Amino acid sequence: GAMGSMERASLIQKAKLAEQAERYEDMAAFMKGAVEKGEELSCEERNLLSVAYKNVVGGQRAAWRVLSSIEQKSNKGPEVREYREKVETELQGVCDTVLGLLDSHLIKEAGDAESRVFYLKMKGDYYRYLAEVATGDDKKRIIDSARSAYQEAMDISKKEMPPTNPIRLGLALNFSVFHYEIANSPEEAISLAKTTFDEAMADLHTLSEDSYKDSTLIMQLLRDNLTLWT
Amino acid sequence: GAMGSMERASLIQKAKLAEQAERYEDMAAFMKGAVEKGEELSCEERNLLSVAYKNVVGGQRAAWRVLSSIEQKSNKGPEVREYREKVETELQGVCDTVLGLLDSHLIKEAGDAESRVFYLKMKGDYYRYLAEVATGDDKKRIIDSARSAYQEAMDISKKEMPPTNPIRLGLALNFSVFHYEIANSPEEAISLAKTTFDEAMADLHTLSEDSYKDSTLIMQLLRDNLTLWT
Amino acid sequence: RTPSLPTP
Amino acid sequence: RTPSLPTP
Numbered sequence: 242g243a244m245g246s247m248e249r250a251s252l253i254q255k256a257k258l259a260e261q262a263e264r265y266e267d268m269a270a271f272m273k274g275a276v277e278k279g280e281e282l283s284c285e286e287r288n289l290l291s292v293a294y295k296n297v298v299g300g301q302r303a304a305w306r307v308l309s310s311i312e313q314k315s316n317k318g319p320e321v322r323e324y325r326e327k328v329e330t331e332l333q334g335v336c337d338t339v340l341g342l343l344d345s346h347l348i349k350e351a352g353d354a355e356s357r358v359f360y361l362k363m364k365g366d367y368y369r370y371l372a373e374v375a376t377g378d379d380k381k382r383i384i385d386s387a388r389s390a391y392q393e394a395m396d397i398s399k400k401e402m403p404p405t406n407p408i409r410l411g412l413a414l415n416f417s418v419f420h421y422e423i424a425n426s427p428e429e430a431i432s433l434a435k436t437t438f439d440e441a442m443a444d445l446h447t448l449s450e451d452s453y454k455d456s457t458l459i460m461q462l463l464r465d466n467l468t469l470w471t
Numbered sequence: 472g473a474m475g476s477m478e479r480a481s482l483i484q485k486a487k488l489a490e491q492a493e494r495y496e497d498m499a500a501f502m503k504g505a506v507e508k509g510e511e512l513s514c515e516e517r518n519l520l521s522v523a524y525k526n527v528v529g530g531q532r533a534a535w536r537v538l539s540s541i542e543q544k545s546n547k548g549p550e551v552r553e554y555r556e557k558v559e560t561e562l563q564g565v566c567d568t569v570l571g572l573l574d575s576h577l578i579k580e581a582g583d584a585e586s587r588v589f590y591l592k593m594k595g596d597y598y599r600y601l602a603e604v605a606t607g608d609d610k611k612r613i614i615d616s617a618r619s620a621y622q623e624a625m626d627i628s629k630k631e632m633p634p635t636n637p638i639r640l641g642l643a644l645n646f647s648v649f650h651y652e653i654a655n656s657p658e659e660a661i662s663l664a665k666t667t668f669d670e671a672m673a674d675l676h677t678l679s680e681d682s683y684k685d686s687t688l689i690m691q692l693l694r695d696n697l698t699l700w701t
Numbered sequence: 702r703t704p705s706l707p708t709p
Numbered sequence: 710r711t712p713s714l715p716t717p
């Protein structure tokens with residue numbers, strides 16, 4: 242692509258600079274370039290990829306929700322619908338780009354549990370974002386694609402990672418949000434969050450101070466959702 | 472341009488939607504499209520144009536300042552300089568676009584004091600942003616272009632607008648910042664802010680409650696700068 | 702919407 | 710930098 246002439250190391254360095262500059266579109270383009278070099282990503286590089294695209298799609302989703310709300314209230318000419326559609330298409334394009342990176346070829350080359358779970362979680366999340374805007378057709382298949390990705394990630398994480406692992410915790414958080422917000426399965430959402438929280442609590446004693454801080458931070462987010470849901 | 476096929480009214484409506492969605496790049500593109508329809512802009516439309524581009528260039532300037540700071544600290548390979556240059560070029564491009572709209576043909580068709588002062592203030596501001604990143608060559612000419620625009624705006628505002636007019640006040644604020652930050656003329660900056668504040672204070676008695684609120688808000692920003700500068 | 706995982 | 714005019 243357009244980053245084909247830049248060194249991998251330079252792309253990663255520029256992604257870090259773009260993060261500091263709050264230039265997330267640039268950050269995402271740099272990390273896409275890095276992925277397209279064809280090498281596996283390190284832990285830190287996976288995090289950069291994730292931060293970049295979460296910020297890009299986050300802005301798009303926030304805009305979509307503002308516009309969708311205006312459109313619903315109005316139900317005046319075609320403009321709100323047209324502009325909501327424009328933002329929607331752009332969002333779908335970003336999701337498709339991320340999903341394309343995961344399929345070509347990040348997931349298939351990810352053999353370690355940490356990397357494979359991370360990428361399958363991402364796959365679940367980006368199908369989830371597609372589901373948020375999907376209507377009528379393919380919507381069921383999109384939801385099932387999210388579910389299938391999260392489920393594979395869960396199965397690996399349960400076998401290969403401690404219950405306090407931040408990736409495992411974040412996966413559970415997001416899969417529980419999927420159940421609550423997308424799958425109309427609030428009880429599954431609550432069960433998953435509660436079991437995840439309790440199993441993590443019981444393993445905190447094994448952790449260093451730094452690991453403890455990370456795990457308990459995510460546990461508090463699980464608890465926050467349980468509070469909102471009950 | 473690319474908005475050539477959309478109705479003027481639809482562009483303005485979509486700019487308002489883009490503002491609500493915090494999609495400022497879109498907002499700016501919509502307002503550029505509207506300007507290119509060739510009709511004069513109303514007060515509200517001028518404000519939309521200004522908000523859109525101030526947000527776009529604001530993000531760029533904040534990024535440039537982060538990157539420039541990193542570059543200075545580092546003075547390691549070409550990456551920080553390259554990326555700072557990239558952001559700089561993009562910023563210069565936005566400034567040139569705005570200046571181009573003002574020159575083709577917003578200023579020349581602006582006969583009322585309110586519109587003409589507004590556009591000349593904008594012209595001063597966008598040359599000021601060019602000056603913030605200019606080095607060695609043309610830098611003096613850029614600074615003088617900012618100065619000349621602000622000065623013409625000041626001369627008109629003094630003749631044609633009350634001292635409490637928000638445009639007049641905002642112009643004085645920004646021209647005083649120009650003097651302090653760009654022209655290395657802190658005493659001129661202070662004088663301008665103080666005289667503007669005092670002349671506005673003396674005219675507040677003429678204002679309705681709503682006008683009073685607007686004028687005093689800007690007066691407080693002048694006072695804040697005077698506090699910082701003294 | 703329920704909050705999902707924020708950035709690290 | 711000194712603050713300039715914010716948005717309205």
Ligand SMILES: *Cc1ccc(-n2ccnc2-c2cccc(C)c2)cc1Br
Pocket residue numbers: 288291362407408409410411412455456458459706707708709
């Ligand atoms: C999805 C996910 C889960 C966990 C992390 N993460 C990696 C290292 N540290 C974290 C972490 C710790 C505490 C809080 C948060 C939000 C993340 C990254 C990602 Br992506």
Ligand SMILES: *Cc1ccc(-n2ccnc2-c2cccc(C)c2)cc1Br
Pocket residue numbers: 518521592637638639640641642685686688689714715716717
């Ligand atoms: C440069 C400039 C100056 C004033 C305004 N403005 C128009 C109407 N109301 C305002 C205003 C009032 C109070 C505070 C602020 C920041 C703006 C717009 C512009 Br652009």
